[PDB]
Amino acid sequence: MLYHLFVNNQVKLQNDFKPESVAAIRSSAFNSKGGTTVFNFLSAGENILLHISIRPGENVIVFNSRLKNGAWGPEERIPYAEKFRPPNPSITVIDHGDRFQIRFDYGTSIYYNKRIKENAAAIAYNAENSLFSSPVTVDVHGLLPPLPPA
Amino acid sequence: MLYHLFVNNQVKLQNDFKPESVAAIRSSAFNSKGGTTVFNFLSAGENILLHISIRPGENVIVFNSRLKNGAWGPEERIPYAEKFRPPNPSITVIDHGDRFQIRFDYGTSIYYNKRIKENAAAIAYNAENSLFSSPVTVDVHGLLPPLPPA
Amino acid sequence: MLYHLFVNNQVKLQNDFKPESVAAIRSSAFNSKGGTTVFNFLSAGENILLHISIRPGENVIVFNSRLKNGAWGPEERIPYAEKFRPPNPSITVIDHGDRFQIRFDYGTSIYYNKRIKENAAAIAYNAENSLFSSPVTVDVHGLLPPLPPA
Amino acid sequence: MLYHLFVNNQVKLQNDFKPESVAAIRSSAFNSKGGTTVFNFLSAGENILLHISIRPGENVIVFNSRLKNGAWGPEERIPYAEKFRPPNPSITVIDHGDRFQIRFDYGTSIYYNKRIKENAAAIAYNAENSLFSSPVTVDVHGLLPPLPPA
Ligand SMILES: C[C@@H]1O[C@@H](O)[C@@H](O)[C@H](O)[C@@H]1O[C@@H]1O[C@H](CO)[C@H](O)[C@H](O)[C@H]1O
Ligand SMILES: [Mg+2]
């Protein structure tokens, strides 16, 4: 399923993002002057199941979760440098049941253990000055699609 | 290469669209009450190499070409009904050297013999009330990619 | 649909290979000392709709057709060199209605106008000392599959 | 990289199967009357890193590991029923660093925590009466490839 996810907006998913689901987010641009750029996977109750905060200014990408009216938990941090490939950078998120896998354009996959036991009903995209295009292209799968060779 | 092509706008291609090239256009929506929706492949000199006029009202899709300041040639027409698959309809255009292949979601491909011997430098998208999303997602390849098994 | 096509053997297709169909043939090896290696697309009546004779020693690839009991027609020839990429070379055949498209690993596509107006029911593979593996992997599609971004 | 893995045989990988690697195993057949069918991922020292024993008669798929000259460890079991899709069933194995993901045609993936900390140098296939074709097609990637749309 193809969605166009606009900056400072969200897309309501046709079906729950749940174990086996794959979200392939692709940008048509890389804005080198972009600031903190965020993607959130939200439950129907607006709990933030997976928060991805890309922060060029701190050279970090931060992962976290929080309940709608609750506090942020411990942060899981990785370096920002050499993760994205211009001019079409990407983020791929896969739900593995007990954890999410997050893949950027370079480096090994990041794994983030689930903290809130709910499926996602929406994906949100926030930035005052995005690193990426508005919208981003998002293809969401219920399961890994058949793979091309080589 | 990924482009976001907005309605009543165009995208300037990073490289010439030429023999072997593939453009996969995908919409995030289908607006069944939409009106005439147009895609043009344009040369650097703004000649319309391939014009695709999708007309729900006349129940036809019209293919044509014209020079920048010239007249339209003879029309090539096919039925509009049962060509598109909501909610993510698509148009795939392939340059076969002597002719373009155009494939929608249903039916056999349309083949359109080239009339203007130039490569395309841009793709334009026009509609007052589009059948499709704005933008559409466009992936352009210099050659057919490795294919998944399904 | 996946088939394993062995040397000096054939595969009977589950469905007719007809307009829009795609056959992606892939080898697990390349024996550069191999001899003439042939693929045939056969109708139910055993007419050879498309014959591909790959001849390293003559430095040509020859395309032709013939009826079951018939003489070969005129040959359509291209050079052999600079077509195949080791160690997993490929041949992709697409039925465009009035002609076949044949793509190797390098170079522009070859187009071969249809001579016998029948669909293919089988694909055969013959060689005394094949350039390719036994079997080759063959994925056959009724229409071009959705394409990866790269 | 494409391999043809024959029954009661193995393939030596051109590169180590290691974190981020993907092996897509595809059969050209499903033999309904077939018996216990095994795939092993082996290290260069012939330790069995991942053993997959598919047992139609017992309605189970058993996962385990053992050193070359060592005994099996504790088993991890899942149901066999409705995991495979005729006529081209598949198994996809992905190395996630601390664990393997194993995905069949239906149901949720199986995750198997690594027991022996070595990369795999070969994949073996064993059966007296295989559920699957001989060979099976195996495409091995160093990283997840770009994904086609749904
Ligand atoms: C019969 C011809 O023999 C020699 O003249 C070759 O140089 C020609 O190409 C012909 O060879 C035959 O060609 C047909 C296709 O036209 C088949 O490939 C046949 O197997 C081959 O012997
Ligand atoms: Mg009009």
Residue numbers in the entry:
A (entry chain D), B (entry chain C), C (entry chain A), D (entry chain B): 1 to 150
Question: What does the study report here?
Answer:
Galectins are β-galactoside-binding lectins known primarily from animals and fungi. The fungus C. cinerea expresses several fruiting body lectins including two isogalectins, CGL1 and CGL2, and a galectin-related lectin, CGL3. In agreement with this hypothesis, we demonstrate that the C. cinerea galectin CGL2 exhibited a pronounced toxicity towards the model nematode C. elegans. Based on a number of approaches, including the use of E. coli expressing these fungal lectins to mimic the in vivo situation, we conclude that this nematotoxicity is dependent on the specific interaction between these proteins and a β-galactoside on the core of N-glycans in the C. elegans intestine.
Based on these results, the specificity of CGL2 for β-galactosides and the reported capping of core α1,6-fucose on C. elegans N-glycans with galactose residues in β1,4-configuration, we hypothesized that binding of CGL2 to this Galβ1,4Fucα1,6 epitope was required for its nematotoxicity. In order to provide biochemical and structural evidence for the interaction between CGL2 and this nematode-specific β-galactoside, the trisaccharide Galβ1,4Fucα1,6GlcNAc was chemically synthesized with a linker at the reducing end and used as ligand in in vitro binding experiments with affinity-purified CGL2. Isothermal titration microcalorimetry measurements confirmed binding of this trisaccharide to CGL2 and suggested a dissociation constant of approximately 100 µM. The molecular basis of this interaction was investigated by determining the X-ray structure of cocrystals between CGL2 and the trisaccharide at 1.5 Å resolution. A major difference between these structures lies in the orientation of the preceding monosaccharide subunits to the protein, e.g. the plane of Glc in lactose is perpendicular to the plane of Fuc in the trisaccharide. Due to the low number of direct contacts, there seems to exist a high degree of flexibility on the side of CGL2 with regard to the identity of this monosaccharide subunit. The only constraint is the orientation of the 3′ (in glucose and fucose) or 4′ (in GalNAc) OH of the linked monosaccharide to allow interaction with the conserved carbohydrate-coordinating residues, Arg55 and Glu75. In addition, these hydroxyl groups make additional contact to Arg77 in case of Glc (in lactose) and Fuc (in Galβ1,4Fucα1,6GlcNAc) but not in case of GalNAc (in Thomsen-Friedenreich antigen). In an in vivo context, the CGL2 epitope is part of a larger N-glycan structure, which may indeed have a higher affinity towards the lectin than the trisaccharide tested here.
